[PDB]
Amino acid sequence: GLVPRGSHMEGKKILVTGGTGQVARPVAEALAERNEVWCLGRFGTPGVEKELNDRGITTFHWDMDDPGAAAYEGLPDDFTHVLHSAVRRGEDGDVNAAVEVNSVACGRLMTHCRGAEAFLFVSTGALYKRQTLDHAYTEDDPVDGVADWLPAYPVGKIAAEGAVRAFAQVLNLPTTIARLNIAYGPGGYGGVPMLYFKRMLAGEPIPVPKEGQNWCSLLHTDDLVAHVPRLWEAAATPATLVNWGGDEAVGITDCVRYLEELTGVRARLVPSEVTRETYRFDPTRRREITGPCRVPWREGVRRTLQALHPEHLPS
Ligand SMILES: NC(=O)C1=CN([C@@H]2O[C@H](COP(=O)(O)OP(=O)(O)OC[C@H]3O[C@@H](n4cnc5c(N)ncnc54)[C@H](OP(=O)(O)O)[C@@H]3O)[C@@H](O)[C@H]2O)C=CC1
Ligand SMILES: [Cl-]
Ligand SMILES: [Cl-]
């Protein structure tokens, strides 16, 4: 029951992109104990590269905005496992840059790592065509590129998924495409739940629907980290597609109310026609691959608050 995080996988050589980010940093940190881990990125945030190096992570400058093959000189080709979590996604409305940069980076990275045992590409649930608020989306539900908040983002992921599927087959590189739901946890900035809390602190409106509430499938960092080795094991040619979320249906308003409950901070719920969109996933396929999640969301969110905003909790 008490098992160290680093024991999920040992003796491998792991390439991680997006290793500074919300999703992949805890993964790289967890695997760095018993594996050789390289993080590819830009490391523009002061001190993050030092923090990763201090854990025994080898860091390697890698910018997806560089279109050429020269960017890969000096990078080993004997990685056994790859986690591609970085996303080139800088608001400018430039859908062509988003499609081009992300798609080409997938191709160049998979080709470089064509000898790997498994390649894991992180995608998003935002590319599902909106059905009902409470619908539990499956891997076969219709897809569109609609996102009012960030239009180029889901379109770029559709294009990147296309590249990933094609290179998986051409290279015979076992691959998993994991469309991630909302990740959260005590590291980084805490995920969407803490973004809501920040708005509550600032007195900013939180749109909610006229009837009911929005729904998601929150995934805690500790569960996310446990899942990565199982997602690599499920990698295949053709690529394995899975909706990657938690085991609990989490109402967004329920989450906001819980933050109020914990802190005494009041949310300004605005019943509204137009709300920021979230998606709940049917966990059936993911559970077949990973087994059940372990962290219930109310305890996870409470401890995330304690880690990132301890002063706003009753003392
Ligand atoms: N809740 C969530 O977090 C969700 C995440 N996802 C997906 O999960 C993945 C990781 O997301 P998340 O951790 O939240 O992202 P973050 O915004 O936390 O981090 C983005 C990451 O992308 C890297 N990156 C961005 N631009 C470049 C570039 N030009 N060259 C190299 N690296 C770059 C950054 O590296 P550096 O700092 O070195 O620049 C950083 O590590 C993405 O594919 C995203 O679409 C999907 C749904 C929800
Ligand atoms: Cl640094
Ligand atoms: Cl974008």
Short mmCIF file of N, CA and C in Angstrom, two decimals, residues 198-258:
data_model
loop_
_atom_site.label_atom_id
_atom_site.label_comp_id
_atom_site.label_asym_id
_atom_site.label_seq_id
_atom_site.Cartn_x
_atom_site.Cartn_y
_atom_site.Cartn_z
N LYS A 198 -7.96 31.42 -7.83
CA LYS A 198 -7.34 32.71 -8.07
C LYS A 198 -8.38 33.74 -8.49
N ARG A 199 -9.32 33.35 -9.36
CA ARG A 199 -10.39 34.27 -9.75
C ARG A 199 -11.27 34.61 -8.56
N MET A 200 -11.54 33.64 -7.69
CA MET A 200 -12.33 33.91 -6.49
C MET A 200 -11.64 34.94 -5.61
N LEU A 201 -10.34 34.77 -5.40
CA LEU A 201 -9.57 35.72 -4.60
C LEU A 201 -9.63 37.12 -5.21
N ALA A 202 -9.58 37.20 -6.54
CA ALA A 202 -9.57 38.48 -7.24
C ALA A 202 -10.97 39.06 -7.43
N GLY A 203 -12.01 38.34 -7.02
CA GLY A 203 -13.37 38.82 -7.17
C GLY A 203 -13.90 38.79 -8.59
N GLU A 204 -13.31 37.99 -9.45
CA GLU A 204 -13.70 37.92 -10.84
C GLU A 204 -14.85 36.93 -11.05
N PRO A 205 -15.74 37.19 -12.02
CA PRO A 205 -16.88 36.29 -12.24
C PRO A 205 -16.46 34.90 -12.68
N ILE A 206 -17.25 33.91 -12.28
CA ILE A 206 -17.07 32.53 -12.71
C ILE A 206 -18.34 32.10 -13.43
N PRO A 207 -18.34 32.11 -14.76
CA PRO A 207 -19.55 31.73 -15.50
C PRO A 207 -19.97 30.29 -15.22
N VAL A 208 -21.27 30.09 -14.99
CA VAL A 208 -21.85 28.75 -14.88
C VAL A 208 -23.09 28.71 -15.77
N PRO A 209 -23.53 27.52 -16.16
CA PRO A 209 -24.69 27.43 -17.05
C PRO A 209 -25.99 27.79 -16.34
N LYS A 210 -27.01 28.03 -17.16
CA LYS A 210 -28.33 28.39 -16.66
C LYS A 210 -28.98 27.22 -15.93
N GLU A 211 -28.84 26.02 -16.47
CA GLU A 211 -29.36 24.80 -15.86
C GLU A 211 -28.18 23.87 -15.58
N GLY A 212 -28.18 23.25 -14.40
CA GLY A 212 -27.11 22.31 -14.11
C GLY A 212 -25.76 22.99 -13.95
N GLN A 213 -24.70 22.21 -14.20
CA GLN A 213 -23.33 22.70 -14.12
C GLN A 213 -22.48 22.01 -15.18
N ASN A 214 -21.31 22.58 -15.44
CA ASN A 214 -20.32 21.92 -16.28
C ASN A 214 -19.65 20.78 -15.53
N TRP A 215 -19.12 19.83 -16.30
CA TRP A 215 -18.57 18.60 -15.75
C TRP A 215 -17.20 18.30 -16.35
N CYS A 216 -16.36 17.66 -15.55
CA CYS A 216 -15.04 17.24 -16.00
C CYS A 216 -14.68 15.93 -15.33
N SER A 217 -13.50 15.40 -15.68
CA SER A 217 -12.98 14.16 -15.09
C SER A 217 -11.58 14.44 -14.53
N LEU A 218 -11.52 15.25 -13.47
CA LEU A 218 -10.26 15.65 -12.85
C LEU A 218 -9.32 14.47 -12.67
N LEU A 219 -8.05 14.69 -13.01
CA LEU A 219 -7.01 13.69 -12.85
C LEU A 219 -5.90 14.26 -11.98
N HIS A 220 -5.69 13.65 -10.82
CA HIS A 220 -4.66 14.10 -9.90
C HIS A 220 -3.28 13.66 -10.38
N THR A 221 -2.28 14.50 -10.08
CA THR A 221 -0.91 14.26 -10.54
C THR A 221 -0.40 12.89 -10.14
N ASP A 222 -0.70 12.45 -8.91
CA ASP A 222 -0.23 11.15 -8.45
C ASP A 222 -0.82 10.01 -9.28
N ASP A 223 -2.09 10.13 -9.67
CA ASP A 223 -2.68 9.13 -10.56
C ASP A 223 -2.11 9.24 -11.97
N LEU A 224 -2.01 10.46 -12.49
CA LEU A 224 -1.41 10.70 -13.80
C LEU A 224 -0.03 10.06 -13.90
N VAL A 225 0.79 10.23 -12.87
CA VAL A 225 2.15 9.69 -12.89
C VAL A 225 2.11 8.16 -12.92
N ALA A 226 1.24 7.56 -12.11
CA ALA A 226 1.10 6.11 -12.10
C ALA A 226 0.66 5.58 -13.46
N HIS A 227 -0.14 6.36 -14.19
CA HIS A 227 -0.71 5.88 -15.45
C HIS A 227 0.32 5.82 -16.56
N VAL A 228 1.35 6.67 -16.54
CA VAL A 228 2.24 6.78 -17.70
C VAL A 228 2.88 5.44 -18.05
N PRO A 229 3.48 4.70 -17.12
CA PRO A 229 4.01 3.38 -17.50
C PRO A 229 2.96 2.44 -18.08
N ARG A 230 1.72 2.49 -17.60
CA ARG A 230 0.68 1.63 -18.15
C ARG A 230 0.28 2.10 -19.55
N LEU A 231 0.29 3.41 -19.79
CA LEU A 231 -0.02 3.90 -21.12
C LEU A 231 1.07 3.52 -22.12
N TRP A 232 2.33 3.53 -21.70
CA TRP A 232 3.39 3.03 -22.57
C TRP A 232 3.20 1.55 -22.88
N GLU A 233 2.82 0.75 -21.88
CA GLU A 233 2.61 -0.68 -22.10
C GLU A 233 1.49 -0.93 -23.10
N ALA A 234 0.50 -0.05 -23.15
CA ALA A 234 -0.61 -0.20 -24.09
C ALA A 234 -0.30 0.35 -25.47
N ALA A 235 0.86 0.97 -25.66
CA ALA A 235 1.21 1.53 -26.96
C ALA A 235 1.26 0.44 -28.02
N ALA A 236 0.87 0.80 -29.24
CA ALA A 236 0.77 -0.19 -30.30
C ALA A 236 0.86 0.49 -31.66
N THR A 237 0.84 -0.34 -32.70
CA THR A 237 0.79 0.11 -34.10
C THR A 237 -0.35 -0.69 -34.71
N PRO A 238 -1.47 -0.06 -35.11
CA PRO A 238 -1.80 1.37 -35.08
C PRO A 238 -1.85 1.95 -33.67
N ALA A 239 -1.71 3.27 -33.55
CA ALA A 239 -1.62 3.91 -32.24
C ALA A 239 -2.87 3.62 -31.41
N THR A 240 -2.65 3.44 -30.11
CA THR A 240 -3.73 3.25 -29.16
C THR A 240 -4.28 4.61 -28.74
N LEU A 241 -5.60 4.78 -28.84
CA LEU A 241 -6.27 6.02 -28.46
C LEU A 241 -7.03 5.80 -27.16
N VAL A 242 -6.86 6.72 -26.21
CA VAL A 242 -7.55 6.60 -24.93
C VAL A 242 -7.86 7.98 -24.38
N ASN A 243 -9.06 8.13 -23.83
CA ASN A 243 -9.43 9.33 -23.08
C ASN A 243 -8.86 9.21 -21.67
N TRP A 244 -8.04 10.18 -21.28
CA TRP A 244 -7.22 10.11 -20.08
C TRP A 244 -7.77 11.08 -19.04
N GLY A 245 -8.64 10.58 -18.17
CA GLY A 245 -9.16 11.36 -17.07
C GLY A 245 -9.29 10.52 -15.81
N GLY A 246 -9.83 11.14 -14.77
CA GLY A 246 -10.03 10.46 -13.51
C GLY A 246 -11.26 9.57 -13.51
N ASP A 247 -11.48 8.89 -12.38
CA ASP A 247 -12.59 7.97 -12.22
C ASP A 247 -13.87 8.62 -11.71
N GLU A 248 -13.83 9.90 -11.37
CA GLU A 248 -14.96 10.58 -10.75
C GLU A 248 -15.47 11.67 -11.68
N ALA A 249 -16.79 11.77 -11.79
CA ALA A 249 -17.40 12.92 -12.44
C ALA A 249 -17.40 14.09 -11.46
N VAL A 250 -16.76 15.18 -11.86
CA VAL A 250 -16.58 16.34 -10.99
C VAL A 250 -17.32 17.52 -11.61
N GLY A 251 -18.32 18.02 -10.90
CA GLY A 251 -18.97 19.24 -11.32
C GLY A 251 -18.10 20.46 -11.05
N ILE A 252 -18.03 21.35 -12.04
CA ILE A 252 -17.19 22.53 -11.89
C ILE A 252 -17.73 23.43 -10.79
N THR A 253 -19.05 23.61 -10.74
CA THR A 253 -19.64 24.39 -9.66
C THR A 253 -19.45 23.69 -8.32
N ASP A 254 -19.58 22.36 -8.29
CA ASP A 254 -19.28 21.62 -7.07
C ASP A 254 -17.85 21.89 -6.62
N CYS A 255 -16.92 21.97 -7.56
CA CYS A 255 -15.53 22.26 -7.20
C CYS A 255 -15.40 23.66 -6.62
N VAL A 256 -16.03 24.64 -7.26
CA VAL A 256 -15.98 26.02 -6.78
C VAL A 256 -16.60 26.12 -5.39
N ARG A 257 -17.77 25.50 -5.19
CA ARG A 257 -18.40 25.50 -3.87
C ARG A 257 -17.50 24.86 -2.83
N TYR A 258 -16.77 23.81 -3.20
CA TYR A 258 -15.88 23.16 -2.25
C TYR A 258 -14.75 24.10 -1.86
#
